[PDB]
Amino acid sequence: NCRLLLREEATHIYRKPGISLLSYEASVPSVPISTHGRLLGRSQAIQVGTSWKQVDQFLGVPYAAPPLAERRFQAPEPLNWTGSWDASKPRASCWQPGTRTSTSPGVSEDCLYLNVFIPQNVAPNASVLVFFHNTMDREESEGWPAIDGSFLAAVGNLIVVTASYRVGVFGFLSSGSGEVSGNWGLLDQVAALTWVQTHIRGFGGDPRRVSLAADRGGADVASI
């Protein structure tokens, strides 16, 4: 339960209702991305304690061109799409080195994809968290793969974005003096950070409050 913070006592209290920049249409949220087009999403009802909140989640948004067999070991070109991307299912995370190689779409290449969770009525200039995490081989049939940051979003009234990035030999390979220089995963993290710097204001967030986060060896490649 949330109460209002006031400096002094008063006898008449009025508040303009909260607004959302997410145009609902038949209970799937949609957002216009400026250069490219539209995003079609998903809506979820989430219980904390005995209270329920609706969070609109957009799993699978891309931020760069896929590196398959030609853009491997190279800087990420932007992905220049047009139309209506279907952000309703999780995509694949990148090739972690220790992997049992179970037959699943959990890990593969083409893994430069976002996951954006926005509560129903956020603060008008809400903070943004950007969590970098490549999930392990888990069956994504139960949607959200191993990080549903939507709970932190719902409890903390803020926008959560969980990204993926190249790691391992695909993330970092260096050979010769030039053009296989390296830090490809770092450039992928920079590209994701520029994407959430540019396009997040249509979601309700504020791009001057972005907070970087990583963990467990990914923090070694985040403090750079």
Partner: protein, 542 residues
């Protein structure tokens, strides 16, 4: 007078009409409406304003239309108060009716005042002749003539009508309540004697019979007594009904009544006051004619003339509460100015302006005004834009000289704000020549002088070209914005213009400490907050 003893809110205390109703409806103001339906469904009968009872005698019998939007001040005289075939059976005229509400047609025919006094209908033939009669010859005064003998329909009586024509004089209902001097025969009548109409007929016919009566007074006191006097050669009439003269304060010695309701004075508008010779008739021409005022008796340097080009007439819209006092021109000529300025001196408050004109040289008007300066919110210390607003163009106007006492009267407090929306400036005094420590004291004296001064702005009015120190008199403070409480962090209210400079210590809007009673009466039109350019509907969670 609530029904019960509970009385939870002011909405639950109920008007006199809305208290008791048996087939009765009430207007939006709470009294009886004009028309009321009869026995529920049926015709409409149109009742008295203060008592629920109908004036029956008017239209109790015709089962006919609604909308009595003509005030039936007439009264159908009972047959016991009329004789027939008296020895002057002359009717001034009549008209043939259209057989479609003939009585209402004749009542509309005597909406105009002249020589009407009563009707006589004639129902013997299908043409219904409204033979009406005149204010002339023919307690307990009856209708003293009628023309036809055999049959007997009723006769009426127009009651309390304003203007009158009685074949020798032209009476008018001069709205002035009281009179100063000149009265032969104030006569009283019993409380059960007359009904303020029989007295009206009696005094009107008494003056019409006599000669050189300029007018007559009548009054009814709440104790039932009715007093009638007959005026001739009045000095000056005073205390009109529609003036702010009551100060909501205890009466001093005697101000308007002079007898402690209803009270009126009527004048012959075409009187021969000046033209009457003194010797002939001798009918109390000896009004005293007081001694001529010497120049050393009163300086009258407390007033200044005002050029009338700055005055702007806005009679249809202005509501400057003010007083008329009407002279009679019999003896006052060019000394009405000195008398009315001395009366301005006598009324210590509420005479910031005096005005003198003449209507038709029988009156001689002097009106007492408060200060009627209306200043635009351009906020410049020139004060030329402050132009007066008056109902009618004067002929000779005078302004009372402002006086500043030795010490201030209130401990004025500095507002913590820097910008106002709804500003009603009264004076724009420039104080550039003096210093600060004395100019601020003079501005405090200026606000202490004015009664409706709720604040004063002491500021550098123009900062583009150096600075100009000024004192603005504020009738009403408005939306006070841009405080220093937040300390410069997150100000979403826009602060003042950079040429105002209301910030530094001596300067900076001061408020008169809040008089817990009220602001005094007669102050200019009730101050409105700045009007909302949009409509703010309630889509806000409360």
């Amino acid at each position: 007078t609530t029904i019960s003893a509970g009385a939870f809110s002011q909405t639950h205390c109920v008007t006199d009409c809305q208290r008791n109703e048996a087939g009765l409806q009430c207007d939006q103001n709470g009294q009886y409406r004009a028309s009321q339906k009869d026995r529920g469904s049926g015709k409409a009968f149109c009742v008295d304003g203060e008592g629920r009872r109908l004036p029956w005698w008017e239209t109790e019998a015709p089962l006919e239309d609604s909308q009595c939007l003509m005030m039936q001040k007439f009264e159908k005289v009972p047959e016991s108060k009329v004789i027939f075939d008296a020895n002057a059976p002359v009717a001034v005229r009549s008209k043939v009716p259209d057989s479609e509400f003939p009585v209402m047609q004749c009542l509309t025919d005597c909406t105009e005042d002249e020589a009407c006094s009563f009707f006589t209908v004639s129902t013997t033939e299908p043409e219904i002749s409204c033979d009406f009669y005149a204010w002339t010859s023919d307690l307990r005064c009856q209708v003293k003539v009628r023309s036809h003998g055999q049959d007997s329909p009723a006769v009426y009586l127009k009651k309390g009508q304003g203007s009158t024509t009685t074949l020798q004089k032209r009476f008018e209902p001069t709205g002035f309540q009281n009179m100063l001097s000149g009265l032969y025969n104030p006569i009283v009548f019993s409380a059960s004697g007359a009904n303020l109409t029989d007295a009206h007929l009696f005094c009107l016919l008494a003056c019409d019979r006599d000669l050189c009566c300029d007018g007559f007074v009548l009054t009814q006191v709440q104790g039932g007594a009715i007093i009638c006097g007959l005026l001739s050669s009045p000095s000056v009439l005073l205390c009109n009904v529609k003036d702010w003269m009551d100060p909501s304060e205890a009466w001093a010695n005697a101000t308007c009544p002079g007898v402690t309701n209803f009270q009126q004075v009527y004048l012959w508008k075409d009187s021969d006051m000046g033209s009457r010779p003194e010797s002939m008739g001798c009918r109390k021409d000896t009004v005293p004619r007081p001694a001529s005022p010497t120049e050393a008796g009163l300086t009258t340097e407390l007033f200044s003339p005002v050029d009338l080009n700055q005055v702007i007439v806005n009679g249809n819209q202005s509501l400057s509460s003010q007083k008329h006092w009407l002279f009679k021109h019999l003896f006052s000529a060019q000394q009405a100015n000195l008398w009315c300025l001395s009366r301005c001196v006598q009324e210590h408050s509420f005479c910031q302006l005096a005005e003198i004109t003449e209507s038709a040289s029988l009156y001689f008007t002097c009106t007492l005004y408060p200060e009627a300066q209306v200043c635009d919110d351009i906020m410049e210390s020139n004060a030329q834009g402050c132009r007066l607003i008056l109902p009618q163009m004067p002929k000779a106007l005078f302004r009372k000289k402002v006086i500043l006492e030795d010490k201030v009267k209130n401990f004025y407090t500095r507002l913590p704000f820097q910008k106002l929306m709804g500003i009603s400036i009264r004076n724009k005094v420039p104080m550039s020549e003096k210093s600060i420590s004395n100019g601020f004291f003079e501005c405090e004296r200026r606000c202490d002088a004015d009664p409706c001064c709720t604040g004063f702005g002491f500021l550098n009015v123009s900062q583009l070209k150096g600075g100009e120190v000024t004192c603005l008199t504020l009738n009403s403070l408005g939306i006070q914005m841009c405080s220093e409480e937040n300390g410069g962090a997150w100000r979403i209210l826009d602060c003042g213009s950079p040429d105002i400079e209301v910030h530094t210590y001596p300067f900076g809007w001061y408020q008169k400490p809040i008089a817990q009673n009220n602001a005094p009466s007669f102050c200019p039109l009730v101050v409105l907050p700045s009007l909302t350019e949009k409509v703010s509907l309630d889509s806000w969670q409360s």
